[PDB]
Every structure is written in structure tokens, then in C-alpha cells.
Design brief:
PDB class: atp-binding protein
CATH topology of the domain at 191-357 in chain A: Rossmann fold
CATH superfamily of the domain at 191-357 in chain A: P-loop containing nucleotide triphosphate hydrolases
CATH architecture of the domain at 191-357 in chain A: 3-Layer(aba) Sandwich
Strand order of the largest sheet of chain A: 9-10-11-8-12
Structural class of chain A: alpha/beta
Oligomer: part of a larger assembly
Chains A, B, C, D, E, F: ATPase family gene 2 protein
Organism of A, B, C, D, E, F: Saccharomyces cerevisiae
Entry title: Cryo-EM structure of Drg1 hexamer treated with ATP and benzo-diazaborine
Keywords: Drg1, ribosome, ATP-binding protein
Chain lengths: ~725, ~80, ~160, ~150, ~80, ~80
């Protein structure tokens, strides 16, 4: 036989005492290791200095040789998830007598049931007790309902064995959430650690619970519920953490595909291993299949024609997975970095139809993640109020969350280095954590996912724009109706405009108005940079368009904004390239096609409509036109109001009306540039100045020029009249 | 008529002959676009509306343009004569 | 539902139905707090929600087939009569052509101002007639197929020839 | 555990009840055979397939007298998800003739002669019994174009 | 730190002698590196060109390389001092 | 498995004696793809070329096939076969 590894299963027996600190090992294995039944057996998860001494031995031939059962009472300490391999060692050490022990409570309740009859009766049956304090379900609390868990924190080797005897030692009642950190005991992963993906985690929980806990409903339905779940997203979004936490929180068997480790030079070894693991999963009703890095294990057959260790394994896994019965309760989890590299056969909605999409967390999700991380960290080692966390989240945009962990680690490193350098190895209690160190670390390390498909520009309010409210009201009444009054549109018939064109002179605030409207509206906003997609990707631009359009369609109705579209249609000026024609026809057949496309609203902004073909400007697509010209007197006055509010104004000797009248020919960017130049001129003399004089404003106005010619304005006006 | 079949016509205060006379220079796509613009103008006032007036149609006609120049029509006619 | 299920095919329809069932189960669990599934049933709104949630996997089709009648176009009936009795002869009067002689016109050209309804009239005629109709867009096939355009053209021509007139 | 626990029948111990059910109880998780009505919308294709299986199988003597080399290969090509595998499963379940299938990549191994020996054995087994049906799935993956890929391994 | 470019006229050939893909890539890269989500306070960008005619108009916008220095030929005093 | 096989085939062909009455014949779909060493008129000088049959050859083949099938199972005249 010589069983190198063993599988784990829970004890079918109920209650406590008898099932804990016990093993069910086949006598043949015990005979080979000459282990007396009245001795201690050591089990370790493939090593990791694990011993976990437990008493008693196995009995009865009902269980196979390989399987060994030790219940979840011991597995809750070393995170011994179901399906983990175990090792048996002959060496053992006689435990000594324990002393000065204590007991805690996981829940908020502290010091309850001092008589503790269940604990008292556990004293007589406590054999081979270990320090980490076995977690017990506590059964019935002798009236009062609910249950309270008990944990013991105080009582080479991961956990020193001990012998617990009544009277010799004194039991102490306390309350602690987890064990002491000086013993480096592993921390089980809970759902509280994962944050910012409440909808995603809820969807995953539902898609795991429905086929597993209630397979009979779908068996009666005759639907053949799917057994494959796909988690696709950028790396560093916690997909591995999600796979681990869903395994830990589920009592079903957990099977993990090693991948490259399983694959060897032997052609039949991979097939044999896959058949064995599938048979093991099918033998036991509750089981979950985990396939880490499915893209590497199952790459695209069309992209790479490798039949050595790629095509055969994909074919055999799909055949085995398609052949399982509907009555079974088994779920296969696959995580990939990109869905495009995944083989289309596996992406067919017959094997991996259930797909969970994880994206870059937004401001609120990042704030929640930061708060959860700070709560997990000790509260006495840092002081950071809500506003500081909000500021950090706002300044954190390109980071994915593994980047967040790296930022926290680098901040800790910098704090330690600064403390040792300055205070010469002072106690770390006084050093704490400062926001300045966090900012320094953020400057030090750049985001690892700066290149993003969609850019989430932080929110901007209507106060900054300071418009005349006419164009703002026009935009409010234009695109809000197709998003909220869909039922009214259906009752009234016709079709939604499904297109808005923002053409105007350069230096305007069309992008600012779009961002302000997106901030004001509660609908999700998606922004795509024009030159950043089609120019960078000569051939991948089409795939990028496909994926962004499908993401926008799936993630509820939303408005899409393009910074530049003039370069997206160069088919009329400077010849026509293949990529330009591809992206143009993709835009056309996405804006207009067989799909009704009611919820989706597209907003496009261009510097000049000259570089736009007449095919794009046709009835039913981007028909609406907005002048979005230079700001008027009121807008310039209101934007200058913020600048005058920044510093003192009454003693500066400047009047708003004269400033607006003199600067009537400038745009908002020119006004900002003039204000910056005036401020620089003011602060250059006498160093810091509490006010700015009109001479600085005049010097800034005369030094710089607007650079706008009347001919382009006339061309825009006649284009608007023509359109 | 097909577009206006969705709502009533008796209280709309619009006559069939003048509607075709005013929109003689447009096309079917232009007519559909004008109808959609008129419907949007009607529904953006007083929230939901069960009827549309002639003022909305006039505003939609004034705001929108046919966008077709007679030189294309002349070129098509001379191509047809040549063929 | 079938009319709104143009892109889906077979396994796509089965996946759509399965997604609708899953959405119904999730909604019932969320709202009624684990009520009996007998009264939950299936609603068309959930089917539409599932259809919006999951897109067809066979959207890219070499040939494109929406049904439309002659009442929608509302034409002068002159162009309609022309389209009705210029191309019906080759498909129905083959024996008449064989006995009389001569060759079929085997060609139709449609040139007009932009924004017209040539495609709408063609679709209406195809829907009215019982003859099989295959429509393929021009720019979408030869642009992305530098060498596969010939294969696609041959495939569509042979499919049209084999699958009846 | 057990797919179907065995039972012992004897007179008097149990009472027989008469009813009418299309299938057995759903709690027994028994597989449901696929019939002709399972697949729809392909009446012409299913009729052509029915003729193409019935004529060479049920009436071989007519074509033997004709001597016109009756066809033995039927090609079913179409977009994925159309229902070709359903047609194969239905024709396999509804036909009493012998059914043989080829795994494909699983059959192919490192030994060059192993695949040839396996193929010779499987066709010898097919020819041993007069009524036989051969099923092959994903021929393009198993046998790609020789001109496109110059791989003879 | 301060970043100084020896030559920048050749970095924007998108207007003269056609627009190659690499030229457009580097132009948009420098543009979105100079201006973007990052505040870019400490970093200072200095651009030097022999002739500003070979610079695209889209690069010369307020907030990006707006400041201009004539740096003309030296006068008699500077010439004497360097001599 | 290509160069060695070709070389040994050429060596064996060159080693055949004049007295020995042994002949080797092979069929290929395309002669251009054949190695020119084999195509050299020293080992494969004799070549039989089969082209596309004309109308008369096709008609002869069809008549032979129908004669083999025999008229007990079909009725047709020479005009039908010619057509």
C-alpha cells in the first residue's frame, strides 16, 4: 500500500467529547507504523511544522484506508480545510501538565454560565488537550437559546502538547476575538475581510448555495443546473481570496487543481490524476472543485495549437465535467486573469455559463476596504479618523487592492525606518502611523494597474463649473429621460435619441459638464479615452470595443463618454487604415443594429466635426447637437468668484464686472491660466501675500494671449447652422 | 399616419394635408426623426402627456434640418438618365 | 420571446431559460424569505431580465435574417409593384422561361439618395414572399477578412444555391 | 452509495397498484432517454438523417444488387450549440444496432503504433457485428487540415 | 526633479511628413504623462525646440508648456562676458 | 523521416540492374510539390499525365457506368447521357 497522503472527512457522530481529539485510521496503516491504539498520532498539512497530537485510533472496516477523520473541531485551528493532504509521523513527545489556563468567548458576550457543566464534564474526557483551545459548537446552552464558542489562548513545534487536570490548574474567564499573536497561529478567513464587492460576494454565495444546498429543486425542475462558475477580472482583485473564503465558509469537500504540478512528462499521468480527482469528488456528495489559474491550465486552442499538454487535458476535463449527473451537488470554480485568452469552447454557455465579473473598486468600495483593513489592524497602533480615510481613498485610484496591501506594507516599513533613524530604536507604541508616511509611501510606489480599460475620474460638483444653467438644464433634460422614463417612452412609442454630440471650441468645459452630470446622477458612469484605445491597439481595438460594450450592457444601463472621436474617424483625411475602418464600422453597428439599445446612452465629444465622416452624423445616431461654445459673462464671473473667495477680496481693489468685461474674449482655461499667473506674480514679491492686486491681473492679461481666431468661431457657427 | 396612430388625432388639432405640405422636402428617415423630436418635446413638458400639439411639431421641424442638397439629386437624376 | 431571441441559438436559449429560473429563485429567496417554490412560477419580466443579463454567444453570424409587412413601408405601390413583379418571375415561372426561352435578368441594382428605405422594402418583400432570403452586409465581411473573404463569399453562394432558390 | 437498491418480489407480501406515468419518480435520479420530440425545428434535417440511417441499414440488399457503393459516412456540420450532439444521442438511443465511439485525444498516446492498433481493433469489432454505428466527435481537432498544419506526428 | 528635453520638434512629426504610429504613440504618451489624474507637483517638465513650427497645435494648450522664453541672440554685454 | 527516405529510395532505384525486370510506379496529386531529385529524368523519366476529360470522355464513362448497372434497373437513351 504505502499511502503517502491521506484525505480528511468530518466525523458522522454528533455531540462533543467523543468525536474531538480522535482519529479513524485503518489498522493496516497503524500496523505498519506500529502505533498502539492508546497512543498519540500526529497529523500535518503537507508539512508546515504541523504536529497536532490527538488520541485514540481507528476502528471498523466501513471506511477506506486512505480516508482519516478528525472532525472540524481540530481543523478550525490550523485551517485544515477539507481535502488537504495529511502526513503521519511515528515520533511523539509525552505532554506535560498544563497550568494558568484561561478561556475566552468569540461572541460579544463575556463571562456567561460560570457553572459551565458542559465544560466541567469535558474535564473528565479531556485527553491530549492542546493550547490553541478547540472551538466547540456548545450544543444547547441550557435554556436561553443561541450558542457561545469557547477558546483557550494560554495553557520547532506549532503547538506544545499539554495535559489538563482538574484542581492542579485554575481556569480564568476572559473574552478575546482570536488567539495571541505571539504564537503565530493561523487566522481563518471570514467574509468580513473581503470588502467592496458586496454584490459580487452575494452573487457568488447564491450561485454556490443554490446547486449545493438545494439540488433536489432543480432535479425536479429538470433544468440540469450548471456546475461551473467563472471569476474573471484584473489580477490583484482578491479572486484567490474569494476562492479561499468560499472554501473556508463551506463545510463541503474542497478539491484544488495544482495545475502545472499535476502535469508531467507522462501523457497518461494527467488523465489518471483528473479521473481520480473527479471520482473522489463524485464519491462524496458535498464537494467543491477549485481550478486556480484556469487560463494557464486551459489556454486558447485557436491561439496556440499545442496538442501536447493543452488540447488533451482540455478535452478530457470538458468530457468528464459534461458527463456528471444532475442529482449530484458539485461546483467547479475557475479563475482567469483575462477572458479573451480562455478557450471559446469553455466560454460557451453550456459549461461555464455562470460568470462573475470583478472590477476595480470605486471610491466608496476603496473606503470600505481601507476601513476594514484598519479595523483588522490593531486600533492602538494608529489614529486615523473618517476624513483621513476618505482622503486616502480619494487619492487612491490606480491601485487594485494588492496595491493597497503593498502600500500599507511600505507605509509600515517607512514608519519603522523613520522611527529607528530618528528616535534610535524607541518603543513602537509612541511612533504609531501618520498620514504623512502613507502619502510618502504612495508617492514612492506607483500603481501596478495604471493602464485601465475604463477611467473613473473622481467626482466634481456643479459649483466648480459655474455655468449659466441653460446648457446644464439642456443636458439634464436630454439624456436623463431615456434612463428613467423608459416606461413612458414605451407607452408613447417612438425611439430614444441614443446619441449626443458635444462639438465646440477647444478649451471649453464639455468634459467638465459631462462629469458633473455623471456625479449628480445616481446612474453608473463609464468613460473611454478615444486615442488611448484605437491608436495603442492596431488589432485589439475591436476586442476592446466588444468587451467595453458588453460590460456597459451587463452592468446596468449607463452613459458612455468619449473624450475624442475626431481621431476615431480618419477615413476622410489622410487615407483610411484597416484599424480605422474596423473601429468606425464597430461604432456604427453598435450604435445602430438589431438590438434596440434603450437603456444605453452614448455621449461623444470632439474638438472639431471636420474630422468626422458624414456616415456617423446621420438621423437616428448622434442627431442631437450642442453648441457648448465659450463661456459667457456670467460663467466667467462665477468661476472668478471661486478664485476671489480663495483669498481676500475686499481690500484687493478688484471688481467682478470690470474683470469679466475686460476678459470677455477668453475661455475658462484661459481664465484659470490668467488667475494662476496673477497669483504667481503676487507671491513672487514679498514672498507670501494675503491678497493680489489688479496690476498683477493686468500684467497676466497682457503677457498671455487667448490664441482664438474669429474664423474658427465662424466655421463652428456655420457648421451648427448647417447641422 | 402610421406614426400618429399611437395617439389620438381628433383633439391633436393637426390636418393631414398641411403636415405633408410642410414636410415635402424631407425623407422617411427625416420624417421619423421629426416625429421622435416632437414626441420628446411633448413628453419633456408636464411630465407624461397623452396628446401632442402642433406647436411641438413646428418646434421639431424648425430645430431639425433635412441635410440634403439638390446637387446630389441632380447627380442621381443624370446618372439615371445616363444608365 | 422567440421574436426577441434572434441572436440566441439552442444552447443559448437553454442558458437563457436557466438564467431566468435562477433569477426567479434568487428573487423569491430575497423577497419571500424561503417560501415554497410552487407559487413563485415564471414571469416574462424575469425572462427579459435574464436576456439582458446574458448576451448570445453566436452574435457574429455570416448571414443575417426582422419580419416586416407592406403596411409599414406605406409606399407609392409603384416601386412595390415593380419589386413584386420583376423578381417573382425567375423564381416561379422557371418552366415558362424554359419553354419560351431567353435568359433571366439575374440582377437588380438599387441606387438612391441616402436615408431611403431600400433595405426596408427589400425586407418587406422577403417577408411577404415565401422564398428563402439571405442578407449579408457588405463592409463587415471583406474588411476583416483579407483572405477569408473569398471563402465566405463561396460559402454563402453555395449555401444559397443548395438551400432552394 | 447505490444508484438503485435491489428489490425482491414475492406474491402476497406487496400489493400492485395500477396508474399511468410518463416516467418514473424524480427522486430516483434515473436518466431520461431522449426521444424524437426532444429536438424540434429541424424537421427536414431530421428526416434526411432518418433516411440516411434507414436506407443503408435496413435495406442493404437493394444497394448490393444495385452495386452503386452505398454511402457509409454522414457529415453533420453547423454552428456550435445547434443540437448536433443531441441528434447523435437520439439516433444512438433509438437504434438497436451496436454503437461505437472514439475518445479522440484520449486514444492518442505517445506510442505511434498504439493508436493504429486501437483503431484496427475498434473497426474489427465494428465489422464483427453486422449492425453497427460509428460515432466520431470533433474530427477537426482529431484530424486537422494537412495543408494548413504540416504536423505528421 | 526637473526634466529637460534636448529636442522636442522631432517628437511631434504628426503634422509634417505624415503621422507614423510611433510618433502618435509617443505624442499621446507625453501628453497624458504631462497632464492627467496625477497632480504632478514636484516634477517640472522643460521642453526645448530649435523651431516651434514642427510642434503640433494640440500640444500648445493652457496648462501644458504654456510658458515661452524668447532666448534670443546675446547682446554686446553677454557676448563680451563670454568672450 | 523525409531526407533519409528520399536518399535511400534514390540509392535503391539507382542500384537496380538492367537485367532485372522490376518496375516501380507512383501516383501524386501535384508534381510541383514533388522533390526535383525524384523528378529528374533518371529515376522517374517516364511520366503519365491525366487531365480533365472532355465531353466525349465523360459521355463514354457515363455510358460504361450505365451499361455496368444494366438496363434492368433504369431506362435512358443516348440523348440523355449526352445532355
Amino acid at each position: 500500500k504505502l499511502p503517502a497522503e491521506f484525505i480528511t472527512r468530518p466525523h458522522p457522530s454528533k455531540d462533543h467529547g467523543k468525536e474531538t481529539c480522535t482519529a479513524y485510521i485503518h489498522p493496516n496503516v497503524l500496523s505498519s507504523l506500529e502505533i498502539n491504539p492508546g497512543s498519540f498520532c500526529t497529523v500535518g498539512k503537507i508539512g508546515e511544522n504541523g504536529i497536532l497530537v490527538i488520541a485514540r485510533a481507528g476502528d471498523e472496516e466501513v471506511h477506506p484506508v486512505n480516508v482519516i477523520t478528525l472532525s472540524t473541531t481540530i481543523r478550525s485551528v490550523g485551517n485544515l480545510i477539507l481535502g488537504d493532504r495529511l502526513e503521519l509521523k511515528k515520533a511523539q513527545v509525552q505532554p506535560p501538565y498544563a497550568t494558568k489556563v484561561t478561556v475566552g468567548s468569540l461572541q460579544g458576550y463575556n463571562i456567561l454560565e460560570c457553572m459551565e457543566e458542559k465544560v466541567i464534564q469535558k474535564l473528565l474526557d479531556d485527553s491530549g488537550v492542546i493550547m490553541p483551545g478547540m472551538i466547540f459548537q456548545n450544543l444547547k446552552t441550557k435554556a436561553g437559546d443561541e450558542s457561545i464558542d469557547v477558546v483557550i489562548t494560554d495553557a520547532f513545534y506549532l503547538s506544545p502538547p499539554f495535559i489538563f487536570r482538574k484542581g492542579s490548574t485554575h481556569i480564568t474567564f476572559s473574552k478575546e476575538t482570536q488567539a495571541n499573536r505571539k504564537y503565530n497561529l493561523p487566522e481563518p478567513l471570514s467574509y468580513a475581510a473581503v470588502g467592496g464587492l458586496d454584490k459580487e460576494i452575494e452573487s457568488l454565495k447564491s450561485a454556490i448555495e443554490i446547486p449545493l444546498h438545494q439540488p433536489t429543486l432543480f432535479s425536479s425542475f429538470g433544468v440540469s443546473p450548471p456546475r461551473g462558475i467563472l471569476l474573471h477580472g484584473p489580477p490583484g482583485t482578491g479572486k484567490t481570496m474569494l476562492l479561499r473564503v468560499v472554501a473556508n465558509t463551506s463545510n463541503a469537500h474542497v478539491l484544488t487543481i495544482n495545475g502545472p504540478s499535476i502535469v508531467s512528462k507522462y501523457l497518461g499521468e494527467t488523465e489518471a490524476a483528473l479521473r481520480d480527482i473527479f471520482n473522489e469528488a463524485r464519491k462524496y456528495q458535498p464537494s467543491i472543485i477549485f481550478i486556480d489559474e484556469i487560463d494557464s491550465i486551459a489556454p486558447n486552442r485557436a491561439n496556440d495549437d499545442s496538442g501536447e499538454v493543452e488540447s488533451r487535458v482540455v478535452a478530457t476535463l470538458l468530457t468528464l465535467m459534461d458527463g456528471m449527473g444532475a442529482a449530484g451537488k458539485v461546483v467547479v470554480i475557475a479563475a482567469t486573469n483575462r477572458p479573451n485568452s480562455v478557450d471559446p469552447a469553455l466560454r460557451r454557455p453550456g459549461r461555464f455559463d455562470q460568470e462573475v465579473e470583478i472590477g476595480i473598486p470605486d471610491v466608496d468600495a476603496r473606503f470600505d476596504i481601507l476601513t476594514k483593513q484598519f479595523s483588522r489592524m490593531s486600533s492602538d497602533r494608529h489614529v486615523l479618523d473618517s476624513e483621513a480615510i476618505k482622503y486616502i481613498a480619494s487619492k487612491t485610484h490606480g491601485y487594485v487592492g494588492a496595491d493597497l496591501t503593498a502600500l500599507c506594507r511600505e507605509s509600515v516599513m517607512k514608519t519603522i525606518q523613520r522611527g529607528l533613524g530618528t528616535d534610535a530604536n524607541i518603543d513602537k507604541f509612541s511612533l504609531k502611523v501618520t498620514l504623512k508616511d502613507v502619502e510618502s509611501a504612495m508617492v514612492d510606489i506607483r500603481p501596478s494597474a495604471m493602464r485601465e480599460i475604463f477611467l473613473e475620474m473622481p467626482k466634481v460638483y456643479w459649483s466648480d463649473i459655474g455655468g449659466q444653467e441653460e446648457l446644464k438644464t439642456k443636458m439634464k433634460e436630454m439624456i436623463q429621460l431615456p434612463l428613467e422614463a423608459s416606461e413612458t417612452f414605451a407607452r408613447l412609442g417612438i425611439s430614444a435619441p441614443k446619441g449626443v454630440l458635444l462639438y465646440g471650441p477647444p478649451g471649453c468645459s464639455k468634459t467638465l459638464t459631462a462629469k458633473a452630470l455623471a456625479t449628480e446622477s445616481g446612474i453608473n458612469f463609464l468613460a473611454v479615452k478615444g486615442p488611448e484605445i484605437f491608436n495603442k491597439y492596431v488589432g485589439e481595438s475591436e476586442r476592446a470595443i466588444r468587451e467595453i460594450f458588453r460590460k456597459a450592457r451587463s452592468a446596468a444601463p449607463s452613459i458612455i463618454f468619449f473624450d475624442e472621436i475626431d481621431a476615431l474617424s480618419p477615413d476622410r483625411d489622410g487615407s483610411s487604415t484597416s484599424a480605422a475602418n474596423h473601429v468606425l464600422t464597430s461604432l456604427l453597428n453598435e450604435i445602430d443594429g438589431v438590438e434596440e439599445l434603450k437603456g444605453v446612452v452614448i455621449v461623444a465629444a470632439t474638438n472639431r466635426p471636420d474630422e468626422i465622416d458624414a456616415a456617423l452624423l446621420r438621423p437616428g445616431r448622434l442627431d442631437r447637437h450642442i453648441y457648448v461654445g465659450p463661456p459667457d459673462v456670467n460663467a466667467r464671473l462665477e468661476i472668478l468668484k471661486k478664485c476671489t473667495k480663495k483669498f481676500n477680496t475686499e481690500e484687493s481693489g478688484v471688481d467682478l464686472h470690470e474683470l469679466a468685461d475686460r476678459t470677455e474674449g477668453y475661455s475658462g482655461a484661459e481664465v484659470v491660466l490668467l488667475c494662476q499667473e496673477a497669483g504667481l506674480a503676487a507671491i513672487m514679491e514679498d514672498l507670501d501675500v494675503a491678497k493680489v492686486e489688479l496690476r498683477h491681473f493686468e500684467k497676466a492679461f497682457k503677457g498671455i494671449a487667448r490664441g482664438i481666431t474669429p474664423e474658427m468661431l465662424s466655421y463652428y457657427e456655420e457648421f451648427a447652422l448647417r447641422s
